Every structure is written in C-alpha cells, then in structure tokens.
Amino acid sequence: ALWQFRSMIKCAIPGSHPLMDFNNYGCYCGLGGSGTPVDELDRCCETHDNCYRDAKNLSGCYPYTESYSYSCSNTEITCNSKNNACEAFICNCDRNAAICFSKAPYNKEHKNLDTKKYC
C-alpha cells in the first residue's frame, strides 16, 4: 500500500520526510508521470511507476491498497518471504524504489517542477 511505500523510504533515508520530499518531484514522482525524467531520482520514480503497472497484470492486484509484509533491518529492508504473489510483487517494486531513492541525489530545483510546461 502507498502508506507502506513512504515508511519504506524513511527506512532507507531517515532524515527524509517522504510525503513532502518525493511528492511532486520531477515528471514521475507523484501521481502521474509524463514526458522525460529530469534526473536520477525521477528515473527511479519512472521505473517504480512501471512496476505498479506490471503489478496490475496480476489478478485482483491493486498496488495502492494492497498491504504486504516487510521489516526494516536497520537501513536494510526486507520483504516477507510469506507475501502472496501480488503482495510480494508490490513490495519489491517498493523495495527497489526506496534503495534507488537512497542513491539518487535530490535537486530542490525539481521539487514542484512545472509538469504543465516541462513534462
């Protein structure tokens, strides 16, 4: 579920405030994504967004509202070996994004980019 996505990023990047930070960032961060990805970060958003899309190729698999199982082993993230297919697919999309976010630099210049102009 989305709410677990955020907690998952806080798990990798502690000094971050997910809701604030990665919302309305570039062309892909935030709901939507159109045009080209302005940066490293934005790429991560892009790929994660396609992961959600792929995830719907699973029956009754709704990525936003599906809760799964994962633990945060101190900066380290782990998906429960027990999630069901949908769940495990969605946790992975999330796990991969999070790690990606932790390695991409953040450009204040992209927060609130002008989609409606720039994307």
H/E stretch holding 98 reads helix 85-103
Question: Does residue 110 have an active-site annotation?
Answer: no
Of the pair 74, 114, the CB lying nearest Ca ion is at: 114
Residues 53-92 that bind its own copies (CB under 8 A): 59-60, 65-69, 80, 82-84, 87
Residue from 39, 94, 110, 114 carrying the catalytic annotation:
94
CB 65 within 8 A of CB 55: no
Question: Does residue 94 have an active-site annotation?
Answer: yes
Judge whether 32 is annotated as a binding position: yes
Of the pair 12, 86, the CB lying nearest Ca ion is at: 86
Of the pair 36, 80, the CB lying nearest its own copies is at: 80
**What does the binding site for Ca ion look like in residue numbers (CB under 5 A)?**
28, 33, 49, 67
Residues comprising the binding site? 28, 30, 32, 49
